[PDB]
Write a protein that binds this ligand. Structure first.
Ligand code: 701
Ligand code: CA
Ligand code: NA
Lengths: 28, 10, 251
């Protein structure tokens, strides 16, 4: 149910240093 | 190289 | 991982280290998909050409790790294997087609800040995210170079490559159960998995529901981070029918 939501990131609404690079590549 | 793990796991 | 960087603490809480009992050494990467199941590459467990055929008792899985060599007291959890399941059509004879295996743990692992499962993709998430140019992330404790070893978990983000380009980069027969990723030459950026990273996850963060999905398994490469070459990954969604069958029957 909680898969893929990281306790130290998504669960606390903190972003890691490079995840934005992935989001920026999802252009379509 | 590798630090020894607790014997219980071996 | 070649040309990557140190992972942040808890950045990849599904990361698993496949560890040989004796001699004590890193065998491969792997990933946590539930409190009792770990996903890896079949070749990490079975590869007759190199006289590799591990049994449950030969191995341990170490979960929640960051340091490569250190015993991370109060953080990592070490689990024993109950049963190994290898895809029945894993093609070790030729090209590593269907390079996938599951490992059932003897006891469930407790989730924590450092231990947490990754999601597996459904048809729609795969269709939306598995597109050339879209970047995924590879993590592992493998070699820093083809020809040394990291102190801590490494991370690299790499773009999925067009199928024709993947096929044209190699003499190996590529199948629908594989995809390739990495930068093209002169693209200004580099990076790749390397020996010791195989079996580990290629993940993507869904922009729809903000969850991480494991789209690939580090499968094979011809060298590491060579110009004109790309890393190849087991296509997790293509093999999900088998994954579900194993979990449904033996879970
Ligand atoms: C592990 C590795 C680059 S390697 O050069 O260190 N190892 C090579 C040597 C032979 N192989 C494959 C083609 C192979 O036939 N193997 C290795 C895995 O066990 C089965 C036999 C490699 O992956 C990788 C680079 C990119 C990805 Cl993805 S992974
Ligand atoms: Ca070719
Ligand atoms: Na390359």
């Amino acid at each position: 149910a909680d898969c893929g939501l990281r306790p130290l990131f998504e669960k606390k609404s903190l972003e890691d240093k490079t995840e934005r690079e992935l989001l920026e590549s999802y252009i379509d | 190289d590798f630090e020894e793990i607790p014997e219980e796991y071996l | 991982i070649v040309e990557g960087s140190d992972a942040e603490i808890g950045m990849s809480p599904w990361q698993v280290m496949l560890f040989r009992k004796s001699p004590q050494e890193l065998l491969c990467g792997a990933s946590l998909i539930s409190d009792r199941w770990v996903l890896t590459a079949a070749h990490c467990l079975l590869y007759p050409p190199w006289d590799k055929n591990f049994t449950e008792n030969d191995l341990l899985v170490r979960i929640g790790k960051h340091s490569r060599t250190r015993y991370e007291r109060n953080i990592e959890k070490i689990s024993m294997l109950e049963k190994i399941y290898i895809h029945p059509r894993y093609n070790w004879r030729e090209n590593l087609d269907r390079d996938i295996a599951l490992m059932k743990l003897k006891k469930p692992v407790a989730f924590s800040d450092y231990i947490h499962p990754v999601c597996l993709p459904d048809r729609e998430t795969a269709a939306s995210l598995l597109q050339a140019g879209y970047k995924g992330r590879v993590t592992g404790w493998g070699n820093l170079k083809e020809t040394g070893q990291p102190s801590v978990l490494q991370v690299v983000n790499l773009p999925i490559v067009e199928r024709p380009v993947c096929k044209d980069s190699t003499r190996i027969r590529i199948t629908d159960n594989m995809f390739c990723a990495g930068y093209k030459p002169d693209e200004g950026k580099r990076g790749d998995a390397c020996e010791g990273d195989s079996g580990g996850p290629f993940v993507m963060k869904s922009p729809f529901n903000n969850r991480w999905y494991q789209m690939g398994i580090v499968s094979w490469g011809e060298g590491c981070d060579r110009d004109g070459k790309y890393g190849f990954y087991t296509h997790v969604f293509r093999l999900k029918k088998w994954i579900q069958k194993v979990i449904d029957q033996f879970g």
